[PDB]
């Protein structure tokens, strides 16, 4: 339908060439927006981390399980090599914290996003310091639109990185390693 998201680069119109609407209800559109926003934020964090690690970056000073003998520098500037070099305990802790946060995101907001509510607004984990606590509602819509466009660009970015890792010389500006 109308929703957020639509702006320029499409002329103010909904971009939907093949299907995916007229078969969707309000609940299905709410889920579409929630999935889009979660993919948006995850991909934004993913491109930021890949760009800070693989390109340059002062890198985290420390040990990262000194008991196992791993160091932060030992993971390497490659990413799939570094993620595989993160200890299994560290992987499990990251995945468990993410799962706890999302189970509480599902169970903590009382108007669920598919039972009313606003998709993409999760309890906790947003602004702890209240930077966006004084913005006007008209300014908030612009920032939500910027978030959506940002996340679409970041999704394209992450899949460019993954495609160039698995298939070399794809994404032509991106190098072969």
């Amino acid at each position: 339908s109308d929703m957020e998201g639509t702006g320029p680069e499409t002329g103010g119109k909904v971009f939907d060439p093949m299907g995916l609407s007229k078969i969707a209800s309000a609940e299905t559109l709410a889920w579409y927006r929630a999935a889009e926003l979660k993919h948006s934020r995850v991909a934004m964090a993913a491109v930021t981390g890949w760009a800070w690690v693989s390109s340059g970056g002062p890198l985290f000073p420390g040990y990262l399980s000194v008991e196992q003998g791993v160091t932060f520098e030992s993971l390497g500037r490659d990413g799939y090599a570094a993620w595989a070099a993160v200890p299994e305990a560290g992987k499990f802790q990251i995945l468990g914290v993410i799962g706890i946060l999302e189970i509480l995101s599902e169970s903590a907001v009382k108007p669920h996003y598919m039972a009313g509510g606003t998709p993409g607004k999760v309890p906790l984990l947003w602004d702890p310091l209240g930077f966006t606590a004084k913005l006007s509602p008209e300014t908030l819509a612009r920032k939500r639109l910027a978030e959506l466009k940002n996340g679409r660009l970041a999704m394209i970015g992450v899949m460019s990185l993954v495609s160039a890792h698995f298939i070399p010389n794809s994404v032509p500006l991106l190098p072969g390693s």
Partner: protein
Amino acid sequence: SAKADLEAFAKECNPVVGYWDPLGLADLPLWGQDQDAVIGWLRHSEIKHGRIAMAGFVGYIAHANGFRFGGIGPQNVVPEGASAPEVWDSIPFLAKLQIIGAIGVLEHISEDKNFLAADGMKHYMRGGKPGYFPTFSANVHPMPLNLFDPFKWSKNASPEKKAKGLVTETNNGRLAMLGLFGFLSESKIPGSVPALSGIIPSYDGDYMQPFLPTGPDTSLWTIGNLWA
């Protein structure tokens, strides 16, 4: 309505021949899509084919005689003298990809409802003018000048002159179709047309496969060529 317009247009195309539809194509419902939409689709296909045939004829002459644009660009890879079927054989593969992609961009602009309603007109299959290319006042960034009349030579002509121009366009398009396929037929089977026997050499590749002889991966770019 559409059929009577076909009869009239065929009368002014050739009064001696007139309406020549042996294979009844102005009566087949293609996608269960009425009569007028089928007529508009057929006219649009005829006009597009004719325009592409005219441009291809002129380009075939330019390539076979040897008409390179200049330096640094993709003409540097094509050898000096290769006949017209081989200039789409030695340009880079990405050059072919981006040429066909820009042609597809033009097709999409030609049938985009947002580009088409910006000019106040409808689809050719929904009661529009067949073969009409829209303006560019829907892009997102302003285009310097449109595709049909790049300069303002047109737009002062009478509608009768425009109709005569359309009839001449269709007739010249059909004749260019015949000429270009005479070229392509001589390039495959010898002695197909009598006049071009010995003029156009034989070709071995497939004319319907855009990327069967894939071009080289040569990256003709200097200054900031960070993509290898």
